[PDB]
Symmetry: D3
Subunit: 234 residues, 6 copies
């Protein structure tokens, strides 16, 4: 409510969640029919339309655990959302994981304290909904995409103090780093709904390639198609 | 051209910047208080503007909500665009009976439940702290404006919707004035990079009372805060 | 010859291994499902066997209970004996009403109260995660076998007899399927060493219901799990 | 009571708190009139007198968070003290911060666990009373002292294992290291009273200058004058 | 019960606890008369017999804090065991501590989280029963053994990532590393019974000597004799 | 001459030192038990003395209260003045019914809520431990003196006035004998620097009973403890 200026009914049961509200705009204009914009509070654009006849929503979450914490909670509790598919970007930690590859997050490691606080310092592993993982994987394979499914690192920090810090995570099989998933999976689990993160590799700690701002906003089409086809099967 | 989060050139951003959380509030500040306004950023809709206030160049830009979001923007602004003075202008919820709605709070420091510094200092407690020159200038301006100003510790929360309704009380017992979501990061980043930072906050609600205020009332108080921030900007 | 915990030579262990906690369960699996069985380990009574399943070499070995115990065995098996695929086959207690006794759980990941990774990552939260190729193969086999299969997060407990009877509930609220004592270590070690790991679990009891099952019933379900693990082994 | 051998009434509402009881003695003999010694328990000297007609107290706290924890608590709860002004010494972490400079602590970073324990591992920032900060700053400026006001580090450890450990703190703007303030500010906040720390730089991690024991006890007059003038305005 | 397949009465009041069940077998066959095997669940052999006329038990615990946590709890609560003497192996952290030396653990440092969780992150020091320490020390000295008594490190990890990690512990006087004692001492203290760990040095971080599997199982006789003589006096 | 906290020369301090928390107790010990006493320290009023006991040189010095205070004094004494044996002689509050007022406790080890070692060992649990030679000598002396002596774990508290009246109980359930404020630091420092340390404690009050004792009674028991410490000193 304080953050989404709309009524229950305005948002579909399944929603795609880019971090960038302008990417939500792009998805809505490019892939959906009969689009209605239901939110402009804080510029966090949210749209509802149809994809091949099925109602779907798309809305920006902003960057970081706390921002997506706010939007995922409100979407679930106040708008009755049941399936949440993050479509985001991430920096590769693996030579095997290339700029513009698509990755499924089975789980999310994190340096956020959100769960450390709640479990008295133990290690909760935020985990994807298996059904969504399986469906998204199958759709991807049927499309010719060599999609990997594994652990991603959700960081609070884009500009770390130590340029070599990523290497410890990569040694333990972490595919890439992004900034939202540990929170999305935690909240989905807590509230009894379903969540999946798909990512497009936008930067690389191996080769140091950086995609442009325009490229991230309007050209990562493969992940969007996977997410939409996934939504269609839910 | 720019950074992956700010699509502008060096020179497009003034040396002093105001930092509302909401990019629509940046647009409002720019339209309301600045002359000859140019928009330098639209990446991710994170509106940023540059204009003059009483003849002096000043910028204003949304940061998004939360420590990680402002961490990205403050870092890029300082290292890529040469920003020297960063003044957050936000809203907060009061934890104290004598911190009333429509009061202005100056953050001397920020407590937090974010893990950003716990990681950095091997589990020790770093206290993110405001630039004193900015605290002193802002206080004297606010006072002379006749405003009800408090200066103290604020709580930078990582979690808006927490498990425990009463958890704020522990912080309130230890004198914390109010809760917001950005300041510990702003102060840490400015300290690391050797620049100047200040957070000003209008009290928009109270965990203690349930006083209601009109939109006109809220606008007037917000404008007062912005004036304090801009008159501060003038003296740097 | 060997390591201080496995008294065998390189070559004695197949590239894929099943890992019951109980070495008497390793003996049972070997006798029941494997041909031309050779025992390669008796050090500390930690029985390990190598035989063929449908003509393919496969090993099976007890790990002991707990993160430190499986930490020793998995490390030695991988680094000294060249094991590439490690499939734990265990029992677990259900934390969920729809995770019923005699169900099979595939661990996609493992939460834990062990400090092994807290130490490694400076207090951050590493999520030990299964090899997806093994998760996908095992799921499809179990499904086609008509089994009631769930795939999700399991809790690797350091303490069987804890101070607090209700402590599991916090984990259950956050979707944890069941509790066991080895998986976070198995997944972390396999990830570090660049090999493949999977945990399969039969639900032996419930924290929610108190359903009773016969030994024949328990044997049948256990055999089904082993078949899934061995049919998975076949495709690697 | 177990630690201060005196009755309510014997201590003034405003008190100066050096760590060194012999420095309390010095302040009392040098700056106060009509001095009465109210405490000698454990040799922790405490005096009450007048400064320009206003009643003030001065008492040693001992070194370290736990010692000042004891004395600040007893002073507030049993003796009705309302304003607590620590006048201490500290080692510089900044080239800008010279031996014999005076510093105001706006806040205190710490490696003490006192607050980690209480806030479930979150980061409480012990903070000075703004009124005292402003008054002390103004008095200092009117005296010709270039006083800095910023973050100080309260350590449990004088002799650290790592000779380079201080450098991380200095990178993040920490002015100097002392051993009391995080506790004084925490207790003052908890009990609803007012606190300020003034420090004289007695050692330097930059130049390695060390002042003598005599110098710390009887020659740091500038901070004492600021504190007394501050008390006078309260 | 789930882990020990026997009835109250089958186990004596004093028990020796090697980690290795085959070492329990060795002790029982070599030192005890009238031996009965009371446990074979999970192959964790347990025996009861007499040593010089006094009933004693010996049982394997398995390796690691969680495994001994299980067996020590069941032994105490369900079988009425009152004295628990671990007879284990450990790797030396001190040039002074040689392969085949015998060590008494007065206390156990640990990297286990078992107590961090329980004491809100404070530092509980698991400590031996003084009576058993004194008796075992005296017996050892009367045998000609130069026995050391000090702090041992209970680790969850045999194969650490950092080959130099042990050096910090050795600097602070840690004698050797093993994998059970912090748990045994914690549980004994909690349940109000008595515990002692004796160790034989089986590996050395100084010289890199490694004893064989056979040697650990059947040749560490000196510690066994000390433990048995200790039991006899209880 | 000296250190910033001890105003004396090398040679002024004996190789064995007794360490009361209270410097007035150091003065009392020196006057009561030592011959040919010289005061070597008055810095910060932290009285230190050197005299002979039965012809042997021994020192005695106040440490102040708390881990940080004794951290300074023990470090300087060892590294600058060549002290080899450090024996704290203090008071403590009992956590146990069979640890009665006027009993003597020998600290085998010290639990703590200080963060000194949590920082040092990356969040692991170091157990500060007494020198066994000193534990054994002191126990045998105390026993032969007919004293009621206990040897075990003590709790080194960082906070005298804690938030929670019942918090000691957790420690009491896990066998902790009593609470004091210095020992974890003393034992850690002596271990680091390769020297010998022991804490002896007279039980001055009880968290369990509320027994009252006369000053004469308290003096007698304290003198007994000092005798144990000094007879121990004699044999080093």
């Amino acid at each position: 409510t304080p953050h989404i200026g709309a009524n229950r009914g305005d948002v579909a049961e399944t929603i795609l969640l880019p971090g960038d509200p302008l990417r939500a705009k792009y998805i809505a204009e490019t892939f959906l029919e009969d689009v209605v914009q239901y939110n402009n509070v804080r510029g966090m654009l949210g749209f509802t339309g149809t994809y091949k006849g099925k109602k779907v929503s798309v809305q920006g979450t902003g960057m970081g655990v706390p921002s997506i914490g706010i939007y995922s909670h409100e979407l679930i509790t106040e708008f009755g959302v049941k399936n949440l598919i993050r479509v985001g970007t991430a920096g590769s930690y693996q030579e095997d994981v290339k700029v513009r590859d698509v990755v499924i997050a089975m789980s999310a490691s994190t340096d956020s304290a959100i769960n450390k606080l709640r479990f008295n310092g133990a290690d909760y592993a935020p985990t994807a909904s298996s059904d969504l993982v399986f469906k998204a994987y199958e759709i991807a394979k049927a499309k010719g995409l060599n999609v990997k499914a594994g652990n991603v690192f959700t960081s609070d920090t884009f500009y770390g103090d130590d340029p070599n810090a990523w290497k410890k995570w990569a040694e333990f099989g972490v595919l890439c780093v992004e900034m939202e998933t540990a929170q999305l999976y935690t909240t989905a689990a807590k509230l009894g709904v379903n969540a999946l993160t798909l990512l497009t590799i936008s930067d690389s700690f191996i080769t140091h390639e950086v995609t442009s701002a325009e490229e991230r906003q309007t050209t990562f089409n493969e992940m969007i198609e996977v997410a939409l086809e996934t939504a269609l099967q839910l």
